[PDB]
Design a protein around this ligand. Structure first.
Ligand SMILES: [Cl-]
Ligand SMILES: [Cl-]
Lengths: 218, 220
C-alpha cells in the first residue's frame, strides 16, 4: 500500500517547509480545499518543484455533470496524480468526467467519495435514507460500473467495497493513526491501497522520522 | 423585489470581465462558478469588483467534512463575496459549523443550500438518495432552515413549496431561468423566487445589456 501525507498545516509556508522535510521519500501528498482556495494552482507548482511527489488534489467536486467535467479538466492540466469527486453527483456526472479526462495523454486517477468519514449513522440516514454500509456499496458499484478508478472510504469498508466490485478497484482510507482502531494493521487486513495520515505526521516533532517508520513498517 | 443574477459562464476570463463591463451600473448580481475559480482564483473576484460594485455569488457548492467546510466558507468570506452555497447533503453538523464560523465575521455573506442539483432526472436521483426529488428537496429545506441557513438553491417549481414548509422569509434562488421562454419570469414571480439566475439568454445574446434591462423592466 501507499502512504499519503495530509498537508494540513495552517499556512502555505508551513506546508512547503514540511514538503521539504519529506524530500525523496516514496510518498504522496494530499492538498485539500482550504489550501487550494487560498493559494490556487501556483501552490501545486511550488510543491512539484520541491520534489516529484505524487499529488492527490482533494477537492470533492459535486455539481452538475458539465461543470464537474470542466473542473476535473482544469485541475488535470496541473499534472496532479489523483483527484476525487462525490459519487452522490450521480452516474451521468461520473460518465462526463471520465469522457472528458480521456482526452488527456495522461490523466490522474479519479476516486469517488462514498460516505464522508465524519458522518455517524443517524445524520447520514437523514440525508441518504440508507445505512452507511449500504450507501457505500451502492455508491461503489455505481462508480465501478461507470469507470472510476476507486473510492475514498473508511478502512472498515475497504474489503466490502472490493468484494462487490473488484480487488483491483482502488481504496483510499483517510485518517489512519499508524501506531494507534484505524491503524496500519487494520489497513493491511482491510486491503487499503492508499492510506492518508495527517496529525501523526505533521504535528510530530520529527515528521520525516514518522514517515520513515511507516514506510519501513509497510 | 425579485433579484437578477447573471451567470458569468463565458469560457475565458477576458470574456467574463468584458461581459461585466457591459453590465456596469445595472442593479444585478453576478455568479462566479467552479471552473472560473479553479482557474483564476481569488484575483478574479478582486478584478470583478474593480469593474463595478456588483453583488457577487461565489457558487462552489462545498461538500466535505464539517471543519473543512467551515474553513472553506471562511476563506471565501474573506474575499468579501455576498453569497455562497453549500450542499445540504453535507448534513446538519456541517451546516451548524459553517454558520458558527461565519458568525465570527462582522458582515458575512448569505449562505444558501443546494438541495437537488437541477441537472438530475428522477431515476438517477433516486439511485443515490432513495427519495423522489421533491421529497428530498423538502427534507433538505427543513434541515437547512432549522440549522441556520438563509435559504435554498432550488427549481423554480419547488420555491413556493419550500417556503410553505419553512417560512416566507427563507430565501429561494432559482437558476436556469429562461425569462421569455417553463421556467420563465412569470413562473419565477408566481412561485416567489427571491433570486433568479439567468445564463445563456444573457451571455450568448448579441446585446447582453439590452436583455438585462428588459428583464429588470419586466420584474419591476
Ligand atoms: Cl501491520
Ligand atoms: Cl443531517
Amino acid at each position: 500500500m501507499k502512504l499519503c501525507v495530509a498537508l494540513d498545516l495552517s499556512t502555505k509556508e508551513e506546508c512547503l517547509q514540511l514538503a521539504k522535510e519529506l524530500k525523496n521519500l516514496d510518498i504522496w501528498l494530499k492538498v485539500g480545499l482550504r489550501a487550494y482556495l487560498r493559494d490556487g494552482f501556483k501552490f501545486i507548482e511550488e510543491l512539484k518543484k520541491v520534489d516529484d511527489f505524487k499529488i492527490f488534489l482533494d477537492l470533492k467536486f459535486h455539481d452538475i455533470p458539465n461543470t464537474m467535467a470542466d473542473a476535473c479538466e482544469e485541475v488535470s492540466k496541473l499534472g496532479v496524480d489523483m483527484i476525487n469527486i462525490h459519487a452522490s453527483a450521480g452516474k451521468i456526472a461520473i460518465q462526463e468526467v471520465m469522457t472528458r479526462l480521456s482526452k488527456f495523454s495522461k490523466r490522474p486517477l479519479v476516486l469517488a467519495v462514498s460516505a464522508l468519514t465524519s458522518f455517524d449513522e443517524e445524520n447520514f440516514f437523514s440525508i441518504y435514507r440508507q445505512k452507511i454500509e449500504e450507501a457505500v456499496i451502492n455508491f461503489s458499484k455505481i462508480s465501478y460500473e461507470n469507470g472510476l478508478d476507486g473510492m475514498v472510504c473508511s478502512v472498515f469498508e475497504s474489503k466490502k467495497i472490493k468484494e462487490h466490485t473488484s480487488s483491483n478497484f482502488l481504496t483510499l482510507t483517510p485518517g489512519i493513526r499508524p501506531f494507534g482502531v484505524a491503524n496500519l494493521a487494520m489497513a493491511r487486513e482491510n486491503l487499503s491501497d492508499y492510506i492518508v495520515v495527517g496529525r501523526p505526521i505533521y504535528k510530530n516533532e520529527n515528521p520525516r522520522a514518522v514517515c520513515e517508520k511507516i514506510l519501513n513498517k509497510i
